[PDB]
Design a protein around this nucleic acid. Structure first.
Ligand SMILES: [Mg+2]
Ligand SMILES: [Mg+2]
Ligand SMILES: [Mg+2]
Ligand SMILES: [Mg+2]
Ligand SMILES: [Mg+2]
Ligand SMILES: [Mg+2]
Ligand SMILES: [Mg+2]
Ligand SMILES: [Mg+2]
Ligand SMILES: [Mg+2]
Ligand SMILES: [Mg+2]
Ligand SMILES: [Mg+2]
Ligand SMILES: [Mg+2]
Ligand SMILES: [Mg+2]
Ligand SMILES: [Mg+2]
Ligand SMILES: [Mg+2]
Ligand SMILES: [Mg+2]
Ligand SMILES: [Mg+2]
Ligand SMILES: [Mg+2]
Ligand SMILES: [Mg+2]
Ligand SMILES: [Mg+2]
Ligand SMILES: [Mg+2]
Ligand SMILES: [Mg+2]
Ligand SMILES: [Mg+2]
Ligand SMILES: [Mg+2]
Ligand SMILES: [Mg+2]
Ligand SMILES: [Mg+2]
Ligand SMILES: [Mg+2]
Ligand SMILES: [Mg+2]
Ligand SMILES: [Mg+2]
Ligand SMILES: [Mg+2]
Ligand SMILES: [Mg+2]
Lengths: 38, 141, 208, 174
RNA sequence: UGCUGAAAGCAUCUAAGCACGAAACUUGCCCCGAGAUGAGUUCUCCCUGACUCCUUGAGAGUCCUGAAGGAACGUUGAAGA
RNA sequence: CGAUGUCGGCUCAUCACAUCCUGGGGCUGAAGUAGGUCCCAAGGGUAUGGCUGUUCGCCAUUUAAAGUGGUACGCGAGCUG
RNA sequence: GUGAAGAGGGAAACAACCCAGACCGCCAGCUAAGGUCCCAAAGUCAUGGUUAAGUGGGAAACGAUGUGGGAAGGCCCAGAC
């Protein structure tokens, strides 16, 4: 995953989550879009 | 005239029991440190150990608010080259449940010989049982 | 459990195939159980043992009584070993060296040979400074012992000169070769601490 | 809010017992117990159940609507029972069940055994497919996910332990 | 990395709950270690005679008694400045 | 400024983590071998030589690796000069 | 303006910040800044809300169904998300 400080939605299937305080993104399609932090 | 200072030999002390089940650590340890010092008594003197003996029992059952069951760290150096040992409030209760109350009281008591003398008063226990039935220690709240 | 035994030098065993294996000879006379410490009284289960022989005069009444409780002869020294839960022993019971007939690897524990006041070169394997090339009064010395005004002090557990040896040490997982019943011997491979005549707490290897 | 506001049915021969907050449901497949959250409150409404959020607490609805969805599954479990269908896709892979210990062969140096906590009925219709039944979705889904964890699908040939319904992306070799 | 799962009639590793997860952390291995003044325990050993004085006080002496043990001294040591 | 001895080498270290190795992970333009980058990780380990006063550097040959820094550009009542 | 040439109380410690100008004495009372659970004098004081981050008790661009407030406009009983 990418740990950039400005996570954001890159496609339709991507979704924003807050696990253990940290803001993450998760996708159905592309595993590339999976990112953390920010 | 002068004011009445307490005189050790004449100090009629008392014994107490404190059930620490479901108590907040700080709120308890304060109320202990008030008594151990003797400020609850009307004949209080800041150079004399007027305060009472307290038997805190069920030390392992003490409660803490928030995430301090995990997040409360207990740092202590070993006096060695780079030995900085730490421990979480869980890990401290798993190992030595007496230490928890003892530190929280010791911090709140004054420093110095009298401070150390008024800590010796405190008796902490993990189990509900105690071996001081000879004193008939009264239940304090 | 474990047995106390006097060290009796080193020899070797030529195995029938060829190999010559160096062995320490440990004489292990009958370890007599004096006192069975239990959870009821002491708060831990264990046994106290002894061996050899003292003279009926060099021994002191405090210990001459202590043995008379058990009903055994006054063995020189006393040691204590931990039981393994399921085990149980009786007072005035001899333990022969036949415990080690089953097991293969053992730990030997004895006091090392005293070297006295050893320097840093000997004690801590410090490298010796240049024996020539201008050097002045500092060949085998330790050099620097700290930094400067930052710590402003020498840290604890610094490797300096001082006492070397005469301290209890354990050598672990030595292979037993032979366990003689007739002369009460135990032939462990390799070398174990302490000089000839020193006592050795021999016991089954912990690292199974 | 919406899920919590929907009474839960209880079929015949399904004995529910409310020990304060501790709910014990007894059915034909197996008796089950559940310690519930403090913010939720539950009572019997003739036949169906009701999940009330307790006043005073902040996130009552959220916690109640969870418990609703739990007991919804738990009542289904004891009556009907749950199942998971795993398949071992890939050559030289084999599964077996001797009693209640799943013996796997997933192309390793050593055969791996997997124990089954509680009444989890591990079946084997074919030798390269592990069906397994029980009551709790929790334990079944866990055990399935452990049996998966030994070998996740290789995203190339799809080689590994997979679920029946699970579609997989097999990217091309470049 | 997951498993059930609302708020958001779906979805989500988490907000309740539950499971894995590293030479780090705490133990396990080894050593010092009750001056650990919070000075812990178990075992064994040793000591059971009169008297006035008196601010009758954990008072002080007079004779009678000095054990367990220890020290010292010697011979010394693979112990050791 | 009525003196805080300044580079480099030796001896001796110690800490940090912004990790070189070893350990655990995600994504890969990841078939496997080996990588690339990012995340967690400071327990341990981390060359010998030739040239030059050198630090550094270049070269030769190794290594699992030959980490970057702080410590009065650590350490002259420790040595060298 | 303060210090220098101004002590005292507060800002943990802190010439210049805040409060206030020490003639001497007193085991009197009222106040300033700053405070009032314990170290340590005084509110575990009262009323209604906010925060769950140990924020409080170092900090930015930027990131995000974190959470608390009003004000308008979009859609329904021809039944919307
Ligand atoms: Mg996690
Ligand atoms: Mg203090
Ligand atoms: Mg010697
Ligand atoms: Mg050298
Ligand atoms: Mg010269
Ligand atoms: Mg010389
Ligand atoms: Mg010299
Ligand atoms: Mg010198
Ligand atoms: Mg769901
Ligand atoms: Mg290793
Ligand atoms: Mg001077
Ligand atoms: Mg230098
Ligand atoms: Mg890191
Ligand atoms: Mg470790
Ligand atoms: Mg070089
Ligand atoms: Mg200097
Ligand atoms: Mg610098
Ligand atoms: Mg220097
Ligand atoms: Mg220098
Ligand atoms: Mg110097
Ligand atoms: Mg010169
Ligand atoms: Mg010269
Ligand atoms: Mg001037
Ligand atoms: Mg004041
Ligand atoms: Mg102050
Ligand atoms: Mg200043
Ligand atoms: Mg200002
Ligand atoms: Mg002001
Ligand atoms: Mg204050
Ligand atoms: Mg003070
Ligand atoms: Mg006060």
């Amino acid at each position: 995953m990418k740990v950039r400080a400005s996570v954001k939605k890159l496609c339709r299937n991507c979704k924003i989550v807050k696990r253990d305080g940290v803001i993450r993104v998760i996708c159905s399609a592309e595993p590339k879009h999976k990112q953390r932090q920010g | 005239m002068k004011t009445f200072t307490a005189k050790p030999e004449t100090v009629k002390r008392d014994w107490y029991v404190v059930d620490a089940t479901g108590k907040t650590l700080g709120r308890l340890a304060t109320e202990l440190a008030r008594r151990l010092r003797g400020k609850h008594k009307a004949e209080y003197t800041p150079h004399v150990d007027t305060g009472d003996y307290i038997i805190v029992l069920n030390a392992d059952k003490v409660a803490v608010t928030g995430n301090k069951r995990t997040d409360k760290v207990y740092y202590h150096h070993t006096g060695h080259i780079g030995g900085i040992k730490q421990a979480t409030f869980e890990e401290m209760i798993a190992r030595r449940p007496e230490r928890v109350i003892e530190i929280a009281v010791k911090g709140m008591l004054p420093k110095g010989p009298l401070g150390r003398a008024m800590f010796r008063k405190l008796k902490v226990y993990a189990g509900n049982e105690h071996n001081h039935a000879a004193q008939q220690p009264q239940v304090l709240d | 459990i474990g047995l106390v035994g006097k060290k009796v030098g080193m020899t070797r065993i030529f195995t029938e195939d060829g190999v010559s294996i160096p062995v320490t000879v440990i004489e292990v006379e009958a370890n007599r159980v004096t006192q069975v410490k239990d959870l009821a009284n002491d708060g831990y289960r264990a046994i106290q043992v002894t061996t050899g022989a003292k003279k009926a005069n060099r021994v002191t009444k405090p210990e001459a009584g202590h043995f008379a409780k058990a009903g055994v002869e006054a063995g020189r020294g006393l040691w204590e070993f931990r039981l393994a839960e399921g085990e149980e022993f009786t007072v005035g019971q001899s333990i022969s060296v036949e415990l080690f007939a089953d097991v293969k690897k053992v730990d030997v524990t004895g006091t090392s040979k005293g070297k006295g006041f050893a320097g840093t070169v000997k004690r801590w394997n410090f490298r010796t400074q240049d024996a020539t090339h201008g050097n002045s009064l500092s060949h085998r010395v330790p050099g620097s012992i700290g930094q400067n005004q930052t710590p402003g002090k020498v840290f604890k557990g610094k490797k300096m000169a001082g006492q070397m040896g005469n301290e209890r040490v354990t050598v672990q997982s030595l292979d037993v070769v032979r366990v003689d019943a007739e002369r009460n011997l135990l032939l462990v491979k390799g070398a174990v601490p302490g000089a000839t005549g020193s006592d050795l707490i021999v016991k089954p290897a912990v690292k199974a | 809010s919406r899920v919590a506001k929907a009474p839960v049915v209880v079929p015949a021969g399904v004995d529910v017992k409310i020990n304060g907050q501790v709910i014990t449901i007894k059915g034909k497949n197996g008796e089950l117990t559940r310690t519930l959250n403090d913010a939720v409150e539950v009572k019997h409404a003739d036949n169906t159940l009701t999940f009330g959020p307790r006043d005073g607490y902040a996130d009552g609805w959220a916690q109640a609507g969870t418990a609703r969805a739990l007991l919804n599954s738990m009542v289904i479990g004891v009556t009907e029972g749950f199942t998971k269908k795993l398949q071992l896709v890939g050559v030289g892979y084999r599964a077996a069940v001797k009693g209640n210990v799943i013996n796997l062969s997933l192309g390793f140096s050593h055969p791996v055994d997997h124990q089954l906590p509680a009444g989890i009925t591990a079946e084997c219709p074919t030798q390269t497919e592990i069906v397994l039944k029980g009551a709790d979705k929790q334990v079944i889904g866990q055990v399935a996910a452990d049996l998966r964890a030994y070998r996740r699908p290789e995203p190339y040939k799809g080689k590994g332990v997979r679920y029946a319904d699970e579609v997989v992306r097999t990217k091309e070799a470049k």
